[PDB]
Amino acid sequence: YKAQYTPGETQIAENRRKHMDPDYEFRKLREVSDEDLVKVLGHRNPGESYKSVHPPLDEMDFEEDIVRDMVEPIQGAKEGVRVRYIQFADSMYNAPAQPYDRARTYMWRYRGVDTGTLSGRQVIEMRELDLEGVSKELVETELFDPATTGIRGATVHGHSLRLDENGLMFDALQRYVFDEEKGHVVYVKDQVGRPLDEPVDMGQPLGEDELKKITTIYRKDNIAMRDDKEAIEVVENIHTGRTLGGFGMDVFKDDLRKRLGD
Amino acid sequence: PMYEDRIDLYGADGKLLEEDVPLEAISPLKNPTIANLVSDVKRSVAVNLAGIEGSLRKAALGGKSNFIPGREVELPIVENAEAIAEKVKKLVQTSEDDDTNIRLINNGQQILVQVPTTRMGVAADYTVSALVTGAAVVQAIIDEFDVDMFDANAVKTAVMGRYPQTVDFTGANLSTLLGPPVLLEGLGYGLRNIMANHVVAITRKNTLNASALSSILEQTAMFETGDAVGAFERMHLLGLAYQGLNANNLLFDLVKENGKGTVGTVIASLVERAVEDGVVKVAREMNSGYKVYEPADWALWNAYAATGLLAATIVNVGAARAAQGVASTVLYYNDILEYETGLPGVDFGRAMGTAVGFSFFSHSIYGGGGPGIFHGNHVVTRHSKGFALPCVAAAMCLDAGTQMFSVEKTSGLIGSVYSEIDYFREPIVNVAKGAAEVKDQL
Amino acid sequence: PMYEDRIDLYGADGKLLEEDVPLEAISPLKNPTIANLVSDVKRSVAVNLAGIEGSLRKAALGGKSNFIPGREVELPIVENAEAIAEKVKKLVQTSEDDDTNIRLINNGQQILVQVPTTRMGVAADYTVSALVTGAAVVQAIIDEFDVDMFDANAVKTAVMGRYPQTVDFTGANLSTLLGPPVLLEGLGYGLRNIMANHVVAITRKNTLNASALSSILEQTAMFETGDAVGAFERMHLLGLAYQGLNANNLLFDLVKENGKGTVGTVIASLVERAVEDGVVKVAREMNSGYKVYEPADWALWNAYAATGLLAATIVNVGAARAAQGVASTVLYYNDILEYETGLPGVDFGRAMGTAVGFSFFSHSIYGGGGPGIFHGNHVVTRHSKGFALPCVAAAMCLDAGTQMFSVEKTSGLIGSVYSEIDYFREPIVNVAKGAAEVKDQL
Amino acid sequence: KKLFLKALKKKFEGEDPDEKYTNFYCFGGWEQSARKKEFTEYAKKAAEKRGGIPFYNPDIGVPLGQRKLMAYRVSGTDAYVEGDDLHFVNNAAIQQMVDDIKRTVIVGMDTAHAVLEKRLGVEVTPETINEYMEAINHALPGGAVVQEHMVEVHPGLVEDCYAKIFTGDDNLADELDKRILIDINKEFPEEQAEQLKSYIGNRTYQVNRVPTIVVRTCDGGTVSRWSAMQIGMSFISAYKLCAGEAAIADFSYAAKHADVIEMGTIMPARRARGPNEPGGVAFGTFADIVQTSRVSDDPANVSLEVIAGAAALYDQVWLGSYMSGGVGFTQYATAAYTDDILDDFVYYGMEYVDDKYGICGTKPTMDVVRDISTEVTLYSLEQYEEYPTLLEDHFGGSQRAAVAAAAAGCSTAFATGNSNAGINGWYLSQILHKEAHSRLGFYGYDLQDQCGASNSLSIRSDEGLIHELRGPNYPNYAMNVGHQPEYAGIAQAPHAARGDAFCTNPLIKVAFADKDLAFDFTSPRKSIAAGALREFMPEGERDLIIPA
Ligand code: F43
Ligand SMILES: C[C@@H](OP(=O)(O)O)[C@H](NC(=O)CCCCCCS)C(=O)O
Ligand SMILES: C[C@@H](OP(=O)(O)O)[C@H](NC(=O)CCCCCCS)C(=O)O
Ligand SMILES: O=S(=O)(O)CCS
C-alpha cells in the first residue's frame, strides 16, 4: 500500500504531504546545541540526569501480556523518565508549520506521542528524554521560522496578530528579541518566561517569499483554499459519508432488510 | 441466521479459539456468557466491613470528613466476618438452592455479595441488589452484636451513607459497579457507568481483556438504548466482534505488525487490509492522483476502522507506557484515516468528536480528570456508541505509573472484589465458549 | 416453608378460591403470577400511532402547545398500522419463538408492544422496552413510507418527544406504566410510579381488584427497596395477603357488616375480630376503666389494622361516591383506631402521616391535585410502605363523577391498551392460581 | 463595501488596514485603558473594607496590554466600549435579560375556569376575570388577600412584578382591562397575528412575571411555584371560594403541571438545575423569546438579533458562569454581536442564496447544503485573510469558527426552510474551516463538530432531534462555547425566511410581546449596548432597605 497522506492539487497540499511522509527528510536550516535546547525547554538543568516518575520497566514486575510486550517502548519509557512538554505558536502569516499539520506529522513520524491542537498553540507531551530528541528536529529544521514560530508554554497570544516592526510574531512575554546587529532572533527567556543566564541565538528569520513557498496554511494572497477544488471535494466527501452513515437507513439498507426478513 | 457473516474467534494470545462462527453467536441477545456477565454486573455488591467498622468507631458518617462526636460505636465486625456473612446469606437468599453467592474478600476485610436473580426478576431496576444487601448487612450487624436501639441508626448510616437526604449512597461503605440510575446522563446508560480503571482492575491490567470487557459492556448498552436496533444492529455486532473480541485476529495482527510503528503505520496497515478484503474500494481518482475510497460494506468498514483504532491506541500508548496520550491517539487516528482515504472515520466522526472533548477535559482546568476516570455515562465521553471507551481501558493497562489517579488508587478494592468472577476477568475466552455453545442453535 | 402462617384465599366476590395456603405462596419472591405481572409491567409499551400521525401532520412536536411551522409531514400511519406493527415485531423480537407480543388497539389507533424478556434480561433497567420500541417504530415508519432524509428527524421527534434535550420523553407519543428511573423519588421506587387512576382504568373500576393490583405493586416494591428484608419480611407478606388479597375474607366481611356503617363502626368490627382471634390482648386497665391493648403478634396486628383501613375507605368513600374523602378516611381511621385501643396504627403511624399530607395536598394551593394522580413515587404519598395507596385505588373506583382529573381524563387510553392483560385486570383470581401452583414446592 | 470596515477603521485609528506589520510593547500596558485604570482605583479603595486581604492587582501574572486593547462596537449601534463593559457581571442589561426570562411563566386559564364552573358552580365572565387580574397584581408581588395579620412584601422592591393576560378570543380580549392585556392584534403584524391565533384557538393564558429580587435571591425553579401559589390565592379571593377546599387542588395541579408553560426544563444530576434556568431553554424557545421577528421583515436581521441575545445567555452566563466561572467567556460571545462582522458574512450568505435559489426556494438536499455552506465559509475565511485588523479582532480561532459557520448554517436554512439542513451546513463549514487554516478552535471546540454531520440528520435515541427543540442539554452540545448562541440563530433562520410568527411555541412568542419588560427583547443588541454604557436600569436593587 502506498499512503496518500492528504488530498489536494496545490503546493499547500503537497507541503502537507511532505511533512507527513516519513521518507521525506526535513531540510535542516540552523544549528541549536543540546544545552541551548534544554535551556529553552526550561524543565531541567543541562548536565543533570533525567528524573523518573516511576521505576524503570525492568525493575518493575509485570504479569504476562503478549499484546503489550509486542509493542516496543521508547527509551524514555524504558527508563521511567518523567513526561514533559514543548509548545509552539504558529503565525497565520505563512509559518512553515501549522497546528493540525503538526499533529498529523507527529502521529505519522513519532512514537509514544501525546499532542494537542489549538488555534493559538500546539503542544507535545512526551517522555523528557524522547522529547529532547524530537524537539531538536522541531527547531533546527524548516518546520521552524524563528520569526513566525514561537516557543511558549503559556501566554500564547500571537498567531492571529500582525507581525511586529521587525517582522517577528507578537509575544506578550517577549521570550525572544530581535538582534538588530546580526539580524537574528535571540531567546532571552525559556518557554514559560524565566530569564536565561545566557541567551540563545536562533538565527535569521526566513524570507516572506520563502514562507509563501513552504507554508502549510491556505491564504488568499498566496494560494487560496478556493483554488484547491480537489481538497474541498474530498472534505465534502468526508462530510457526506458521515451524514449518510449517521442517518444510516440507506447505507445500511441491506442490514435492515435482513432484520425485517422472514 | 439473520446475517450471513461468519467469524473466527481468536484469544488475547493471538491463537484460534473457535472457527467459522456466525456473527450472532457473539450477540448480547444470544451469547449466554454475555447474559451471565450482565446478570452478575447487576446483582453483585461490594461490602466494606473494615470501612463500616472504622466509620462506626470514629462516627465518621456520611463521608467527606464528616464526623459526629459522641455517636461512636465500637464493634469487632471484621473479626466476625464469617458469622455476619452467613446471616447476610440467609437474609438475601430466596431459597437454599438459589444462585446467592457470598464470598469473603481480603480475608474478610471486605465481602462480595451476589444477590439471587429471583429478586432481580421481580424488581424494576438493578438498585435492588445494593438496597437488599444493605438491609441484610445492617440487620446482620445489629443482630450479631445486639446493638442498642439508639445506636442502631449509626450502623445504618455507616453502611448506606447519607441516603435518603442525598439522592444516592453518598459516604456509604457498600458499592456496585453500576451507580444509581438517578445519576444517569442518558436513558438506558446503566452498563456505561463503569470507569475505565475499574475495567482494568477487574481484568488485572491485561490489555485485550480490558478492551473486550469495555466493548462488551458498551455494545450491550447500545442494545439497551435501542441504538443497536434494525438497520444499525449489524454495525454494533461487527464492532463488538472485531474491536472487542479480536475477530479473525485482525486486532492482534495490526499490533503485531506495528510493534515499532506509529499511528500512521497502523492506518496504512489497516487501509491495506481493508482494500485486500474488499471492504473498501476506489470510487474515483482526483487530479493529484489522490484516490477517493468508498465502503463496499458500511458496517464492516466501520468495524475494520474501529479495530485499527484500538490497535493504534495500543501501539502509541504502549510505546509511551503513559496513558495520557489515548485521547490524542483516538482523535488523530480518525483524523488521519479520513484524509488518507476520504472515508468516514470510526462511528462516522463520533469516536473522533469524543476524543476532541476527551483531550480537552484531560488537559485543562474546566473538568474531567485523568483518562482512567472516564466512562460511557460521562458527559465528556458518552458520544461514541461503544467505539471509544475500549481504547481507554487498553490505555490504562499500559500505563506504567504516570497517573495520580491510577488504577490502584481509584479501583483497587473493586479489582479484588470482582476479578474473582471469571467472566469479568477473562471475557474473551469465555465469550468464545458461549459462542460455540449456541452457534448451531442459530 | 419459612413461616408457619396459613391463609385461605378469597375472591373479590367473597367466595373461597384456595384453602390452607402457606403465606409465602403469595410472596413476590415465589408467586409465579406476580413475577409474570411485574415482567409484563416492565416490558409493555403503548404506542400511539394516531398521536404520531397527528403530531407529524401539524408538526406538533415536543408537546405543550409546541408547533414548528414548515416542518409538517403527512403520512397515512394508522391506515397502514398492520404493516407497521409487523415491522415493529421483526425489529423488537430476538427470535420468532420468543415472547414478543404485538397487538393493535382501537383498530390501529394504538399498538401494544410487549418487548421480549430476552432483551430485558441483558439490559440494566426497564427503560429498554420503550427505547427499543421507539427505535423500531421510528424505523418502521421511515421504511414503510420512504421518508426523506431531511424529514426523518421529525418522525423521531414525534415518537420520542424532546429527548435528549429533556431528560425524559417529554411530548412523546409512546408511554409505559413506569416512568424513566431518572425521575424516581427514591431508590428502587420503579414499581411505585403508577398513578391510582391508571390502576383503576387497568382493572376497569372494580374496587377490590384495583386495591389488589395496587397492593401487589406496592408490596413488591417494598421487596425491591429492601424494606421487606429479614425482620420486616413477614409484616409485608401479611400486609399483601390480608389488605391486598382479602385473606380469610376479612376485608370482604368488614365491608359487608358495615355496609350502612361509619369509619367508627368498621373500627369496632375490626378490633372485635382481632381480640376474638387472639391477635391483640388487654395489657392493663386504666382508672377510667379504659383498656390498653397489646399486640400478641405485631406483624399480624398490622395486617389486621391495614385491612380495616381499606374497609373503612370503601365504606366511607362508598357512601359518598366521591373520592376526595379518601385522604381524610385514612387519617381518621388510624387516629380513631389508636385512641380506641392504645395500639399502634397501620404501618406504625406512617399510613396516617401519609394521609395528613395527602389531605393537605388535595385541598390546598401548594401542590398535589385530585386523589387519582397520586402514587408511591409521589413526594406526598411515598411515606407509608405499601399500606396507603391501595385505599386510593379503591376510592377512585367508587367515584361516580365528582373529579376534574377523572380516570377517563387521565387514564382512558391506558384502559384500552393494558386492561386486556388478564393478570393486570383480575389480579386476585390469578394470584391465587399462582399460589396453588407453588404451595407444595415450598 | 464590507459591513465591518467602519468599525475596524475606528478600532484601529490611523493604521493602514492592508499592512501586515504593526508596533507592540509601546502602550504602557494596562494603563492604556480607562476601564482598567478605573478597576485599579476601586481595588485600592477596597483594601480598607477587605481589612488588607489582597485583591485585584494588574501586576499579578500576565502584563495585559502588550498589544493595543480593543474597543468593541455593539453591532447596529453607535456604542463603542471596552470589552470589560460587555462582561455579564459588569453589564446590568445582560443580567436583567436573564432574570426577565427566568422570572416568566405562562399559565392556561381555561382549565381553572372549567373547575370554577363545573365543580364550584361559579360563573366566569369578563368582569370576574378583570377582578381576578386585579387581585393577582396585588398578590403576585406579595400582598395579602385572605388572611388576617399577614406581613407583606415592600412594593418598592417589586415594581417589576406583574401579571398580564392574552387570548386567541378577540371578543374576550375586547372586554378585558387594557392595563393588563397583551394584545396580539396590536403587537403583531396582521398576517403574523392570524398565524398565531390559528394555533392558539380561543384559549386564554396569563403571563406571570415574578419579582426580579426573588429569582436573584433564589432560583428559576422558584418561579412556576411562586406563580401557582398566588394564582391560587387570587382565585380564592376573587371568586369567594372556601379558602382551602378540594377543588382548589385542581387549580394547583393545573398551574404547576397540566397547564403551565415554562421557559426551560430540568437538567440531569451531573449539571443539576430546576426549571427556567438557561440550560433548559431550547434554541427555538429562545428564538421565540426574542421579539425581533414581529418588528422586522429582514431574516438576517431577525437571526442576528437572536444570536446576540443567545450569546449573552448561553456563552457568557450559562457556559461562562453557571458551568464554569471566573474571568469567563465575554469575547467568545461578543464575536457574534460586535463590529458588524457576523453581519457581513450573514448578509453575504443571504444575498447569495436569494440570487441562486431564492429565499425558501428549494427543498433541502445534500447538494444544496454542500453548495451554500462551502461558498459562505470560503467567503468568510477570505475576509480574515484579506483584512489583518479583522484577524487581530477575532484573534481566537473559536470565535472565527463560530462566526463563519453561523453564516454558513443560517444561509442554508434561509434557502431550504429546514433547521436540520442548517446545522448540517454548520458542521461542513467547520471541517472545511479546519482544512483551510490547519486549525479550528480551542482544545475541545470541535467535539460536536466532528460528531455533528452524523447526528445532524440521525433518527436514533439521543442523536436524532429536530434542531429547534435541541438546546444546551443536547448531549453533543452540553459542554462547549461558540456553538449554542449560533444554534439559536440557525433555529430562527428558516422561520425568519418563511416570515413565521414563531419557531416552536406561539404562547412563548406572545408572552414576551410586552413593553413593560425592562429588557428590550425587540433588540437584544440595543439593550446590551445600553448596559455597556451603564445607561440601563435593572430591577431588584435593594437601596430602599439598606443604609445610604
Ligand atoms: C388559603 C389558606 C389555604 C392554604 O393553602 N394556605 C392558606 C393561605 C396561605 C397564604 C395567605 C396569603 C393571603 O392571605 O393572601 C400564605 C401567606 C402563603 C402564600 N400564598 O404566600 C399562607 N397561607 Ni396560611 N399562613 C399562616 C398560618 C395559617 C393558619 C392561620 C390560623 C389562624 O388562626 O390565623 C391557618 C392554618 C391553621 O388553621 O392551622 C392557615 C390557613 C390557610 N392558609 C388558608 C386560609 C385560611 C383563612 O381563610 O384565613 N394559615 C399560620 O398559622 C401562621 C403563619 C401564616 C403564614 C404567614 C406567615 O408565616 O407570615 C401563612 C402562609
Ligand atoms: C464536564 C463536566 O465537568 P466534570 O467532568 O463533571 O468536572 C461539566 N463541565 C463542563 O462541561 C464545563 C462547561 C463550560 C466550560 C467549558 C466551555 S468550553 C460539569 O461541570 O458538570
Ligand atoms: C408537593 C410538591 O408539589 P407537586 O405536588 O409536585 O406540585 C412540591 N411542593 C411542596 O412540597 C410545597 C412545599 C412548600 C409549601 C408548603 C409548606 S407547608 C413541589 O413543588 O415540588
Ligand atoms: O486551551 S483550552 O482549549 O484548553 C481552553 C480555551 S478557553
Ligand SMILES: [K+]
Ligand atoms: K494581570
